[PDB]
Amino acid sequence: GEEELQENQELIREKSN
């Protein structure tokens, strides 16, 4: 869940624009 918790906030900002 950790990778989908805080780390998800990175890919949703960058890998989503």
Steps between C-alpha positions, in 0.01 A plus 500: 500500500797727566578516127134591437484737800762778470681369195169503307489876559821530294395300195154666508672842488776417252372188316167682445602868459 
